[PDB]
Write a protein that binds this ligand. Sequence first.
Ligand code: BCL
Ligand code: BCL
Ligand code: BCL
Ligand SMILES: CC[C@H]1c2cc3[nH]c4c(c3C)C(=O)[C@H](C(=O)OC)c4c3nc(cc4[nH]c(cc(n2)[C@@H]1C)c(C(C)=O)c4C)[C@@H](C)[C@@H]3CCC(=O)OC/C=C(\C)CCC[C@H](C)CCC[C@H](C)CCCC(C)C
Ligand SMILES: CC[C@H]1c2cc3[nH]c4c(c3C)C(=O)[C@H](C(=O)OC)c4c3nc(cc4[nH]c(cc(n2)[C@@H]1C)c(C(C)=O)c4C)[C@@H](C)[C@@H]3CCC(=O)OC/C=C(\C)CCC[C@H](C)CCC[C@H](C)CCCC(C)C
Ligand SMILES: CCCCCCCCCCCC[N+](C)(C)[O-]
Ligand SMILES: CCCCCCCCCCCC[N+](C)(C)[O-]
Ligand SMILES: CCCCCCCCCCCC[N+](C)(C)[O-]
Ligand SMILES: CCCCCCCCCCCC[N+](C)(C)[O-]
Ligand SMILES: CCCCCCCCCCCC[N+](C)(C)[O-]
Ligand SMILES: [Fe+3]
Ligand SMILES: [K+]
Lengths: 241, 302, 281
Amino acid sequence: DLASLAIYSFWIFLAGLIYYLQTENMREGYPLENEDGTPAANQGPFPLPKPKTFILPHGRGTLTVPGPESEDRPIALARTAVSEGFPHAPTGDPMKDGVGPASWVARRDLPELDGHGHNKIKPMKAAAGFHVSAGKNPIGLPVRGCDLEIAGKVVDIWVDIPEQMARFLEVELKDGSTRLLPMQMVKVQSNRVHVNALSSDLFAGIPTIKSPTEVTLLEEDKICGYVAGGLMYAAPKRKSV
Amino acid sequence: AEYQNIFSQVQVRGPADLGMTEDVNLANRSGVGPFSTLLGWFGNAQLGPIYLGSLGVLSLFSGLMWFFTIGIWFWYQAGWNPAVFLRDLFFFSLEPPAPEYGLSFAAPLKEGGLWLIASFFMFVAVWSWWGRTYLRAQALGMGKHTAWAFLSAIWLWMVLGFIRPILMGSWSEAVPYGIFSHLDWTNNFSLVHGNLFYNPFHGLSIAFLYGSALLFAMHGATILAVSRFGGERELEQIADRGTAAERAALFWRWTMGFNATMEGIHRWAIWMAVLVTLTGGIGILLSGTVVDNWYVWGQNHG
Amino acid sequence: ALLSFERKYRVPGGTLVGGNLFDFWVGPFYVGFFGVATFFFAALGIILIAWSAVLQGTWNPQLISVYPPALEYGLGGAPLAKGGLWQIITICATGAFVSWALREVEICRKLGIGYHIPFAFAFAILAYLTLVLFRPVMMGAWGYAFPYGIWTHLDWVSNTGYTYGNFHYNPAHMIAISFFFTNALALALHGALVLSAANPEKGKEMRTPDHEDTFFRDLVGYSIGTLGIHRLGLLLSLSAVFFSALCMIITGTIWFDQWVDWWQWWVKLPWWANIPGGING
Ligand code: BCL
Ligand code: BCL
Ligand code: BCL
Ligand SMILES: CC[C@H]1c2cc3[nH]c4c(c3C)C(=O)[C@H](C(=O)OC)c4c3nc(cc4[nH]c(cc(n2)[C@@H]1C)c(C(C)=O)c4C)[C@@H](C)[C@@H]3CCC(=O)OC/C=C(\C)CCC[C@H](C)CCC[C@H](C)CCCC(C)C
Ligand SMILES: CC[C@H]1c2cc3[nH]c4c(c3C)C(=O)[C@H](C(=O)OC)c4c3nc(cc4[nH]c(cc(n2)[C@@H]1C)c(C(C)=O)c4C)[C@@H](C)[C@@H]3CCC(=O)OC/C=C(\C)CCC[C@H](C)CCC[C@H](C)CCCC(C)C
Ligand SMILES: CCCCCCCCCCCC[N+](C)(C)[O-]
Ligand SMILES: CCCCCCCCCCCC[N+](C)(C)[O-]
Ligand SMILES: CCCCCCCCCCCC[N+](C)(C)[O-]
Ligand SMILES: CCCCCCCCCCCC[N+](C)(C)[O-]
Ligand SMILES: CCCCCCCCCCCC[N+](C)(C)[O-]
Ligand SMILES: [Fe+3]
Ligand SMILES: [K+]
């Protein structure tokens, strides 16, 4: 019977398809490692796929996954148990060390470029013809930490040109330097921008950008990570409200 | 609350974005349209420009010829009165030829011909739009996944309106153009074929439709959740994994025990969707051609 | 075993209950208080189902069916073999689903991400709790809920719909359906768009988001953007479910006749109500 041939074939295909799908999703973070970083014993029934190579634009090489996996950065943690499966305690300051919710990946130290080879993200002062077009403009607003203290003042929005959206607020600090706060972790309010992740005193600590009119992917990860970790690691100084 | 990033807090605007050229014939692109601050809270404020070559003209014109073949019928059915047209809009229906005319085009405008005309016009509209989905990919140097994905939808549509009625001997077996009539068609189809809940393909189709809601809820939630780390920038995350890809993967790994990569989620995405209409299409094509009653079939096939 | 990049994230912290007491993983799975809550609830949920199975007299998953209490029982308790087990298995299910959500919040807290996933899941829990709690409570009996069985639940769906004629005419349900279909359209397209960019014509370099917009603006005259679309899928799919819940919460409670007839309100507005011609005059 043709319905029976059809249905039975289909389950075969769905099996093959799931197989395919699952191996395609092992292109990163595999093979599995024990907590010491060595190759784990049981990997699983699905093999690593045959590798594929992406040609990056703008002369930026290729990326060829799966491949030799490495953090390319040292990890300040230490076991807390004598066996698998327990948390790993920061050996210093998790925020300054970039661990836990302060974690950052070691992405390239160049800026994401757009489809015409131009920095995707620029301070709005440098992005010709960009302006705030609706909503409250935060440039000038003071910035407040979860300790209810003033950390700085907003001095520019950093915009995504091709996507025409706000990605960071550049915030000037007590000492004149600036920091990028991810826009997703701020609350623009009538009369201030409130950042809840960090307390005022941890703002200096935000990773800085080597060049004042661009952010590299690496620096983005460092800043985004630093800011997120605050939620966890600044909760002592986080006053209720 | 923290920002949830469902709507934006500040909108910025800059010069109108005319797009990448690659190989696209710019003679056939339009100018930018207005910008909508309202759309801006959720997505992009920019409307236009739109590529509109010879195939687009064919598709839209043919597309309208469809919507006015039906319309004319509806106004007519209303006795030309706009009060009635508006009142009874959902009850009007352009119905296919009787079973007596089989696959012939020999049937009177008032009792089938107008249905065939509208079907002709729709068939030209969709297929032409299909070529568009390919060519626009092509002109930009991109993959053809969209065209291939679209073909899955086209399949179910083709089965319902063209392949199945052809294999059954009569245009009468096709769906009518009408809001309520097509819901009645759908219901009575299931009744006539033994309750389509007994059709395994219908079953799968439901699993994927729901699963599509499950997946996109998961996925969309996940990107929004890691958007403080640049998550939505999925292509550069594909070329250079960031803490956003890693936190997303690990959320899921720690929740359900396994997980996607940032390109890989999109293969689960494309397939979960595409398999809705793929399976469903098979389900219907078999209905009444190979299997008259799915309850009965069920009894004899597990 | 851990992902190549995972250890750095496995720091202590983020639990809502029990401090460190349950802050560990088993293989890839985070446990936590809500892991233990979930295990407890699933376990007992499953035993009690195997228990119902034994008393129906079957072990086949296509036959096992735990039925709610006969409508007689109203909103009270029924005995174990005749309505209770479903009642207690629903206490386990909701326990297990709600615990799973709170576990997801603990994972988010450890990982410093947003709480979107677990909030989203909450919508699915609500649809479920509409079909087994809010709707059966408002109607007056646990009997109006669906029974736990692979096929028997589909039996309930059909029955329930047909009680109101062709259920297609439920207007909340039309909105529901349109969201499920549009969601599926949006997934197809999003999947396909990213992949077409990651995976361009042979020999060619990866495309950029600008190519994704240019694609869609060329095709339909608009591009919602990469943040937009993720907002969109979440919105469509959560909308689909919210209207699913709504379309049932109103059915058998505020509207309980044939849904087809509901549309007479529009057909009979007094201006066109009596004009001759058309379908309805
Ligand atoms: C699938 C099994 C049955 C069936 C069962 C059902 C059931 C059951 C239901 C529907 C419902 C719908 N069905 Mg049906 N449906 C079938 C086949 C079809 C087909 C088809 C061509 O095959 C079509 C077109 C429709 C159409 C529709 C819609 C009327 C409605 C919601 C669709 C939706 O969410 O779309 C996807 C969403 C989209 C947004 C795509 C549409 C976008 C449009 C085309 C673009 C607008 C552009 C604008 C005009 C631009 C102007 C600019 C200028 C400058 C002026 N059905 C088959 C036969 N269908 C539901 C309903 O509510 O009916 C009332 C419902 O409950
Ligand atoms: C009482 C009714 C029967 C029943 C009768 C049917 C029938 C008959 C069919 C389905 C089908 C489906 N049913 Mg069923 N269904 C029932 C019960 C259910 C229940 C439920 C909770 O009980 C659910 C969730 C579903 C769900 C589904 C879907 C999984 C599937 C349609 C997929 C889809 O995307 O189509 C939507 C997609 C399309 C129609 C493709 C359209 C693509 C074209 C190219 C678009 C044209 C655009 C146009 C030109 C412009 C737009 C204009 C305006 C919108 C007007 N059914 C009961 C048992 N169902 C379909 C199926 O696959 O069955 C196997 C089908 O044929
Ligand atoms: C003859 C039958 C009637 C009909 C009668 C009904 C009835 C009756 C109902 C629907 C409902 C729905 N129908 Mg209708 N419907 C009909 C025709 C259709 C057609 C069609 C194409 O013709 C379509 C597309 C639909 C579409 C739909 C959806 C809008 C909705 C189902 C989704 C939902 O509620 O999800 C919500 C999702 C859930 C409830 C999932 C819950 C998941 C929970 C949170 C977790 C469980 C986890 C699990 C136990 C884990 C297992 C272990 C792990 C796997 C390890 N109907 C026909 C005409 N329809 C339903 C609805 O709206 O319900 C609210 C409903 O009750
Ligand atoms: C996995 C299957 C799912 C799916 C996938 C899918 N659909 C797709 C695609 C894909 C992958 C596309 O690429 C294609 C698309 O382009 O999306 C943007 C499409 C598409 N899916 C569509 C609809 C659609 N899909 C559906 C379903 C699904 N599609 C499934 C759930 C449904 C239903 C019934 O649920 C519908 C209704 C269309 C939006 C689009 C195909 C468009 C098309 O074929 O158009 C030809 C028709 C016309 C040209 C007529 C429209 C004209 C307008 C009225 C504008 C007039 C302009 C004029 C200049 C003004 C006139 C004014 C006066 C002068 C008169
Ligand atoms: C709200 C939009 C959509 C959605 C969203 C959604 N679902 C989610 C999430 C999100 C965002 C998760 O994070 C979570 C997840 O982990 O996903 C992988 C989940 C989830 N969605 C799931 C399923 C699911 N979602 C569905 C639907 C949807 N989910 C919507 C379409 C459906 C259906 C019918 O369409 C199902 C079946 C699970 C895979 C997972 C939740 C897993 C979970 O809670 O596990 C804990 C409990 C157990 C492991 C065991 C429970 C056992 C009980 C004690 C007994 C069983 C009782 C049951 C009621 C009987 C069922 C009988 C059937 C035959 C009807
Ligand atoms: C549509 C249902 C989803 C089925 C999920 C199948 C994937 C299981 C993958 C587990 C192995 C991955 N692992 C443990 C090596 O990381
Ligand atoms: C859901 C589709 C969205 C289209 C329209 C969105 C309008 C919502 C605007 C709300 C945000 C405004 N504000 C000032 C509160 O930020
Ligand atoms: C037999 C052809 C099948 C193709 C599907 C036709 C059903 C579409 C019904 C949509 C309603 C038409 N209209 C004019 C009211 O919009
Ligand atoms: C690409 C994602 C894979 C999704 C998993 C689908 C699981 C199928 C559910 C089975 C129901 C079908 N059937 C034949 C019993 O009717
Ligand atoms: C519907 C069933 C889905 C269940 C998927 C759960 C997969 C978790 C696998 C964990 C075990 C790891 N492994 C395979 C390496 O041993
Ligand atoms: Fe995505
Ligand atoms: K400027």
